[model samples]
Target chain A: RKFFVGGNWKMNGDKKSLGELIHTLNGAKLSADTEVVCGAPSIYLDFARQKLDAKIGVAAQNCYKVPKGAFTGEISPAMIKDIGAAWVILGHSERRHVFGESDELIGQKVAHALAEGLGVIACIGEKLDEREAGITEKVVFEQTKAIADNVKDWSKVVLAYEPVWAIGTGNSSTPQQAQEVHEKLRGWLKSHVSDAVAQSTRIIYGGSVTGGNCKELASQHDVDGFLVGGASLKPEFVDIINAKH
Target chain B: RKFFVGGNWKMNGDKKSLGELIHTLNGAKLSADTEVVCGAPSIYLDFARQKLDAKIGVAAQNCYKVPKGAFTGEISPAMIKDIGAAWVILGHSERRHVFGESDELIGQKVAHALAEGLGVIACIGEKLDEREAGITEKVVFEQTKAIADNVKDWSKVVLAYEPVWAIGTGNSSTPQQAQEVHEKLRGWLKSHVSDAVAQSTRIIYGGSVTGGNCKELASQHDVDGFLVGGASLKPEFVDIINAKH
Candidate 1:
């Protein structure tokens, strides 16, 4: 409830090293309070699910428009659910910015997952350009609004805001900057979505969050959780998980 | 050697159902003459591997231009191979047509898969309009020629000549018409590629091939096998495998 950290190993790892990486997590003693999830390359998910310990769950970074069939080169929600994965991270920045996954598509996935009783960590954020242009609220509002248009239920889903500029770049916003975005996000959530959703829904921040900085980020008023990136691969992923409490 | 029967279950299956399907196939009596494989959705390969019989191999329906990293929705052959899938069905018309996966793009996937030591089922065929216009040979030749020119190694690959027009509508060509196209393809292969490559490589047909009709198509000298379409979902999939024998 306090903090959720998810690693999207976006197109990283091979068989030998993927197993080694999972082995590292399997051996580590993770924090009990934090909800941890790692979205590996689709091929590695089953291996991770089987091999990784129970505390840290597995996620499929992206999925298809439909529940199943001929949408080749896709992993279906039915496939993910049947694998016993409790959570799926929808609309990561890479999928939104790099690929052409529109807001409508993410909404469809969110709605479908909700119907199937699967947990979704729905991601929402704007680029630094929009932030600088003072349209950050407008952009983020549109993204969250798309979800609101389709999915009214938010009990099973958490929203993570990962600023595009900070992702994998080593340079990220200070605690103050992130707090500003987080506070704006919470106020918008209360106004745009229902009050119950605004409270229960965990709006996490992701973008260069490490064990060293995660604790401070966790202390921010509206920073409900942390979605880790590169640091999720390290032994300190354990430390990042322990940050909230 | 006699015939090739492959099923491309393009983004299909949940774990329970996939396990049931694989379990059904594992115990079902399979024919010895066919080189059988199924291109499963990426998520199910490990489960398919665990549940499938020793001989039935797993294949990924598609992969990316790069072997790994950066492309958000893309799959890499190294990841595919690491999870122990060997065959990759590249440049399927759906990927090329629907997803805008280019021949140039697929060329990279073929190269990556070969580099990762996985076999390729390189798919090529003309569209409906091209077929209706009697330019099927020209279109097929162009599509096939591009991939052949791009990937120098044709040794670890099987050529599946699945005409896009014939793909799922149940509008099948008569045995003689199928032979004519296959014959043209054989002539094209012989002239375009080396004779050793021509004689050694398998050229299979696809598009709504079923148990009853497979024998007639498989009997043609030009047709070395079939890439079974809708029939893949049935128990008679095994019958398509033994069609030549």
Candidate 2:
């Protein structure tokens, strides 16, 4: 499988820093084989698109379910694509916990985003308590189930396993632990959804990913790539992009 | 109060139409004395700012409380101001009902937006049931209280009364009905917040406002201006802009 590294800048990076980061990428010697994507704030999608190398794909951190409507303060997938972003990250932990996005709603967004012909990094994860309770697999399965049921085609979807407890806390899931969830999720997709989708789908890891740990995480068989956080805003993002190489 | 007309293009318009709308505004003869603001989707603020006349002020439809963080799919007031917009519209009924934004959250956004040095169009209104319950004033008071308790400066705030039953229903509030609520809200501000704020703040009407009805609504003693809805998308928006003239 080709390596796919996605940098989720979250809410960080002003135009000045973003321009600097783009310049870094333009000058850096990145792996030819890896597909690098950047998740930027909606307000800066156009800015990023205009500044970054055309090969580096841009993704909206999130998008609304509808094409367009009375939903205030939301960018539709059409709007994302319209603004030159070909991808969107749906169901992120920040959106789930802070804004109260339900699994069902996230699933609907995934479906709508796909219907709009945009790529999706559909996220699923277990919280701290859920992980401690040994129901991590169950929670991940349920979240994936929401997407699988809603999405008819898995070709455009990349499942990201972001452990809530590990996100932004400087705590990361061990390669072994992350692989366990990713492997089980792959198997679940194979059995419940379809074998074709299971094999084709990329299951990436997120939550406290950094340059120091990305290569080791990349070594895991099922860990296709990463959805990087803090490190994504820095020069280290280039290193993570080349983790597989 | 200076007559303030805000055209809330509410989850509508793409780059093509947005540019055409700007062209129309650029050509039209607007009321020089009135303060004209356009409440556009955050994604298009930069586009609107660049295309519209410099005299026209741009506003974000909404913003997050924090300046920057891991809140996915949310724009901050700092980002809004960074992109050259001067104002943000918070607590619109669509946001209140469709997305379930609490009054407290909107108030926080208002305070934060103000702190960021951006002007605010703080929306407050009641549902059909609440209005029928004869508690329209009560609901409006509570919404205003949320902002009044949080916001220290009235100079940067514009209050838009968008009745839930009237909004998008093509059933606008009668001139008398809108004035009653506007008058009561003004009194509420005078009694609860301060007479200074009450006298200085622009109490605008929103909900099924069109060029046809705007002149009459503008003639009301307490209706200082308008927060236009559907008509804001039309050529007649120019007429509504000059409604006070």
Candidate 3:
């Protein structure tokens, strides 16, 4: 599996600013070995897909569980694919915590998005209370199980482990901490899903990932890549993308 | 107040389909007595704004309460303004019942979107259960009050009265049924806010408003216009816009 780096721009950036960022990215010298995707805000998905380099993939930050209907204020995977975006990020911590999305809902969304032929960056995370309660593994495992149960093909999914405690708080999990979870997730997959999936699937780390620490984090055996937050909007994101260079 | 018609395409239509719709709208000769707006999906907002004629306004189906942040999947009023969309539809029935958006949250969104200088089509509706319980007025008034409390300028707001039971169910309210609610809402505005607002604000009816019923609905004294759903996507939407003719 290749190193995979995803930038979750969140609900930020207008066309002008994103245009500049896209210009920066289009002209930048990125690592050939890494597969990079930017998770753009729903409104900007088409804009980003139209302007970004073909080598760089575009992903909608989220999508609906079904193709189309009376689900107002939502975009569907059909629309995402219609606009030529190949990927979607589902079950982000902000989506789960801020918007009150349930694991069952995320699972359904993952299944629908995948069934529509878009790659799924499926996310799982333990909240601060759960982490402090010393049940982070149990929490994440449950979340992962929900996602796994709906996933028919592991090849179309990239599992993102974003600890809620560290996300947007400027606190980041240590490389060892991320590795421990990733390794455990891989082991869980080996036992529960299949050994081929355990070896082939990419489990990315997310939460306060800056360029300064990308190299060290990337060096960890199980730290396959990153699902970046704020830092992804900055030029330093290039360095993080090239951490494995 | 001039007749106001807003078409909420909901989570339907891709670029090609919407482009054809926009072409139809552009080429059609609509009533000069009416003001028209289309509430497009978030992904196609910029596209719709760019393609639609200057006379036909484009509105986002929904927006976030804040300018920008880590609310992963949400779009903002600032982005709407930046992309040249002038209006946002908030607190629609689908948002309330299906997505579980509280009145308080919708109020915040209304306040923020208005504060950001975007026009608001603030929706209020009674669900089937609430209507069956003889609490339709109670439900809509409470929902309206939540939206009203946040509104600083009535000029920037269009009040939408959509009965949840009728929305997309093909069981539209009779003209009298719609007139009753619109009158009650205007009276509520007069008492709660100001006489000027009551007289001037546009109070539109929504839910299964097809071309066939649009003229009758428009003829009602208090039925200022419509917030059209499924019928809005078809060629007959032109007739709804021409209801005042």
Candidate 4:
């Protein structure tokens, strides 16, 4: 599998710091095989895209389902594409828990983002309650199914499983545990979706992933790469980017 | 009254159209007395601020309550001021209705925005259901009271009364109806807040406000100015900017 690492600089970074980040990223020695997509705040998509190296992809942290009009305080998918950015990160746990985005809305966003010819990092995961209740698979499957049902093209999508309990809490799942879920999810996709889609789709991991833990995590059979949070803003992110090496 | 005319671009505009809009506005003859603040989508705030006329103030469509951190997909008030944009439009009806922002959350946002030195166009409105129930005044009062309770510095806040039914519905309130609500809201502040806040604070009208209706609306005693929606994007926005003349 081709590794796909995404750094979600969620609601962080100012113009000055972002400039410094782009400068640092441009000079990093990343593995040629790994695809790096850096998700910046919507306001900085153009700025980041302009400054970051051509090899590094740019993504918006979020986008609206509608092309345009009257949905105040939202950036539309059309606008995301207009700014030379090629991807959008949606259904992030912060949006799911803090802002209360439902599965239906995320599905619609996935559809819209694809329709706009933009790539999607469609996030899904279970809260601590659901995970501890032994319903982690059920919750994640439902989220996956929601997007699967609406999407006509699976080639442009990356499914990111970010356990709500793990995000920003410094509690990462063991590599074995994450691989178990990834394999189970791949199995479910094969059974429910077409065999081709199951084999080809990228199912990445997220939540508290750091350079220290990434190599082991990257070695997992189905753990394709990472959708990193806090660590993405630090210099150590380069290590995670090269974990597979 | 300074006759404030705010342009709520909502979820609209791209680099090309925005450039043209700015070009048109810069060439137009605007009222010197009017405070024309253009609220662009957060992504384009810096771009618009850079390109738009220096005399015209730039605004962020929305911002978060926190100074900073991992609240992904949300822009912080600190970021808004950091970007050289001086104003934020919070508690907009779209955020209230579509995104489910509550009065308490909006109040917290207002308090945070003021603390960050960003001017606020704090929006409050009643939906059709509440208006038909004859509780327009009551609903608006509660929304205003929520902000009044949280905000210590009232000097920078402009209250925008955008009735839900009238917003983008082609169903604007008559001058009399809008005046009644604006007057009642000011009176509520007079009783619940200080007299200085009640009188000095600008209570702007929103919802389906066109150049055709603005003069009559502007003629009303408590109608301090306008928080323009769809019209703000068009050439006619200049006419609305010059309405008081």
Shares of reference contacts reproduced by the candidates, in order, are: 0.68, 0.61, 0.87, 0.75
lDDT of the candidates, in the order given:
0.79, 0.88, 0.93, 0.90
Candidate maximizing DockQ: 3
Q: With candidate 2 superimposed using the best TM-score fit, by how many Å does residue B72's alpha carbon deviate from the native?
A: 1.3
Question: What would the DockQ be for model 4?
Answer: 0.82
Which 10 successive residues of model 4 chain B have the least lDDT summed?
B76-85
lDDT of 2 by residue, B68-112 (tens): 877778888878878888999999998888888898898898889
Off by over 4 Å in 4: none
Q: For candidate 1, write residues A1-245 as lDDT tens digits.
A: 45777877777787677788788877777667777788877776777787878767788777776786666677777778777676677888888876657898899888887787777878888898898899877888889888777676777778888888888888667888888877877777788777777777788888888888888888888887777768766678778777865
CAPRI-style docking class of model 4 based on DockQ: high
lDDT of 2 by residue, A1-245 (tens): 66888888887767787889888987889999988899888778889998888999999999888877777688888778778889999999988988888998998999899999999999989999998998998899999999888898888789999999888999999999999988999999899988888888999999999989999999998999999888888888889988977
Measured against the true two-chain complex, the DockQ scores of the candidates, in the order shown, are 0.58, 0.71, 0.88, 0.82
Which candidate tops lDDT? 3
Please, what are the lDDT tens digits per residue for candidate 3 over residues B1-245? 98999999999999999999999999999988889999999999989999999999999999899998999999999888888999999999998888889999999999999999999999998988888899989998999999999999999899999998899999999999899899999999999999999999999999999989999999999999999989988999999998988
Clashing pairs in 3: none
Q: Put down candidate 4 lDDT per residue, B81-161, tens digits, no spaces.
A: 777889999999999999999998998998888988999999999999999998888898888889888888778889999
lDDT-superior candidate, 1 or 2: 2
Superposed Cα RMSD, model 4: 0.9
Q: Write the per-residue lDDT of candidate 1 for residues B1-245, one digit (tens) a residue.
A: 55677888877777776677777777877777678888888877767777777688888888876776655556788777767778889988788876677777777777778877889998888888888898988877887876787667777788888777778878766678778887787787788887777787888888778888888988888888888767787788878887866
Residue B17, model 3, lDDT: 93
